[PDB]
Amino acid sequence: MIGLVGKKVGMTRIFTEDGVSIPVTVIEVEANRVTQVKDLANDGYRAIQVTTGAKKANRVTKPEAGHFAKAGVEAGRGLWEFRLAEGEEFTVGQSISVELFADVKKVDVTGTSKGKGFAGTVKRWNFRTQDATHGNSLSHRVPGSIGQNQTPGKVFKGKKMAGQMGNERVTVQSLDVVRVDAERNLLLVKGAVPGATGSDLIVKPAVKA
Template sequence: MSRLQSSTFFSKLIHLNANTKNVIRKWKCDSYSSLLGEKFIGTYNKDSSRPHRLLPIFKELPTENLVPPVIPEQKWTPNSIRLGVLARKKGMTALWDEWGVRIPVTVFQLENCQVTQVVSHGPNARRKNIVDIQIGCTDRRRPERYMTRALIGHFRKVGLAPKKYVELFHVTPDAALPVELKAAHFVPGQFVDVQGTTQVYRRHMVLRSPTVPLVQRVKERFDPGKVFKGKKMAGRMGGKKHTSHNLRVIKIDNALNCLYIKGAVAGYAGEIVRIKDAIRKHGTLAFPKDALPPPFPTIHPKVLESMPRELGAKTGGTDPFLIKES
């Protein structure tokens, strides 16, 4: 094959590959247009050379339900199980009460925490009085690249922007609601359970074992002939779910949608955690007496508009620095 023939052959091959890529690009764009509906077809160029850059088509997706949310009027009972939320851990800080006592708190922020699905069980279900509610938070950037069509359609069905994190909560049927959750869903002074992921750190806080030929047996031959429980050996530690129970809500910031919870919580700053009412303090024990009944099934938007920006729990009481006479 001469140089002229070879150059012509490769030029035809390159042209064929380019046509094939254009067909694939057009198919991708058509598939997304059929998924999103007719109102989104004209918002991007089908002949674009970079079909994955379809972010403008998702800017018109609503961030709330297409149907105006209606909060059902329900009466709270001590046996009611309220819905929890997903929040991002921002870090730790400190607050001071009226006597100057330092209170270490962890700050959590709610990022577009919305209900994405409500699953009710049939009459033959094992738990008939429990409803599963799916919660999503943190809108996903460039969902057409990082999410499947089925998952995008799942959020489009309820008229919400695609979410990055999704979790399931179990509540009673009277606590089911199809609205967005705010920080005012909780009451200052109440007790909550926070579930996070423990950090991965060095096991037993020691260095690794020496390399060969210094490694020896640990079972000591015939006597005792076994490894005792609790022996410090190599293994994985951390990276597991851990729930901190009975943590008190010290302050709520309605403007920033933040919760200030007393104490430390497992996980790095920036991770997503689950927050719900304390399960070990049943009924009225989880809430202060002046806050009963709590917002049920959640805080009403009209009530939220009239609330101040910050709400704090009652702290202080008797002077802790007062010397008691014996």
């Protein structure tokens, strides 16, 4: 039954009686404003706009605001939509909380993975460094070969080369919920989710059991 949007906000530890530290990702979920339920409005199916929040009244755009203008003239900070099949719904001014998961198990999350700028090689593709002695001919952090002599006359498509990390999401599927607290905005999930503290996270039930 649908999914929710929130923010990573940090890494934390579970304090288990197994003595291990065990990471848990906080995931802070303000109640999603559910500003529209659709009735056959495109492609012959039913959907709901979940709406992550609102925007500051001094920094609003007209083509964004019209998507939420019946609920408020302050946009939504997330124009996310989900399929409606497990229920029948109508549009009201009551936001949905993490209580949506109080009887649910096993979830998947879309994050905002590691922004590293340049990323390089040793921290992009786990490359190794070449022999640093017998005299080194400007060849300490170099890949070795990138291909083979003359016959291909090209590098292969999908070769590992240096290139940035950032402007990416990543989706992680080995997660389950711990806190589900609709009074603390606290979802809390088992393990470490992609991205830094400011990463915006989308969560739904996983099809892998």
